[PDB]
Write a protein that binds this ligand. Structure first.
Ligand SMILES: CCN(CC)CCNC(=O)c1c(C)[nH]c(/C=C2\C(=O)Nc3ccc(F)cc32)c1C
Length: 239
């Protein structure tokens, strides 16, 4: 990828918290989101992302290495984080649009799955909303963790699929907090007993069926993103 000189970056306003995210411009031209900061792990993260090209995965302009704190320079996504966007635009969403959002994410995730990339932190807060409400996965939390993850630390694309199910719930609930007021231990025990998040009003029976398939106890009973994508698309086509 391209190396970016600090002089080429204009930091306009802080927009995110964690490192930090700033609204800015590169070369007095492109609107960018600048993410300031382990330095080597921070850079490698960018290196991985710059070689993964998909319409539903966020893209970088480059890396600014010269001056501490080092930063990553991303494309600007006008509607920000999905979690935030869902909450602010609550009441304006048709079910079809919410399903479309899930499809966008599923597309990105199927590409990552094929590339043998586990996200490990897939959630609406780690998705971004751009031009014409296109959703992109970014940055590629027990409430999003599968049973084999919170118990055995057993990650796979199938554990991402569980996370995606929770993301679907976030989307169809229009940005509600999953398992609100519940402690980590309460989430673990409830899910292990068989508790699943309720069906949001905007989620059809068909959509909820898919959520529950993402929430199967055994990873092998969950669909891969590649197949999940077609299941989601089929519901859209059915009407
Ligand atoms: C006034 C209302 N505002 C418009 C949505 C809300 C404030 N703005 C916002 O929250 C916001 C906006 C408009 N973009 C981002 C973040 C990113 C972006 O654009 N590309 C990225 C690439 C990588 C990444 F890790 C974050 C971002 C935020 C937090």
């Amino acid at each position: 990828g391209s190396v970016i000189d600090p002089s080429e970056l204009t930091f306009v306003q802080e927009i995110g918290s964690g490192g930090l995210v700033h609204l800015g411009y590169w070369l007095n031209k492109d609107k960018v989101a600048i993410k300031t900061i382990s330095e080597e792990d921070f850079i490698e993260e960018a290196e991985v992302m710059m070689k993964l090209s998909h319409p539903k995965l966020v893209q970088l302009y480059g890396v600014c290495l010269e001056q501490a704190p080092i930063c990553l320079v991303f494309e600007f996504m006008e509607h920000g984080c999905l979690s935030d966007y869902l909450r602010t635009q609550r009441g304006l969403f048709a079910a079809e649009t919410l399903l479309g959002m899930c499809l966008d994410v599923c597309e990105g995730m199927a590409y990552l799955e094929e590339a043998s990339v586990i996200h490990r932190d897939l959630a609406a807060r780690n998705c971004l909303v751009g031009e014409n409400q296109v959703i992109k996965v970014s940055d590629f939390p027990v409430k999003w963790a599968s049973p084999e993850v919170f118990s055995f630390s057993r990650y796979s694309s199938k554990s991402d699929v569980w996370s995606f199910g929770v993301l679907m719930w976030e989307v169809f609930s229009e940005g509600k907090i999953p398992y609100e007021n519940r402690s980590n231990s309460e989430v673990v025990e409830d899910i292990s007993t068989g508790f699943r998040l309720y069906k949001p009003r905007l989620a059809s029976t068909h959509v909820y069926q898919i959520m529950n398939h993402c929430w199967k106890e055994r990873p092998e009973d969950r669909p891969a993103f590649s197949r999940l994508l077609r299941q989601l698309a089929a519901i859209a086509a059915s009407g």
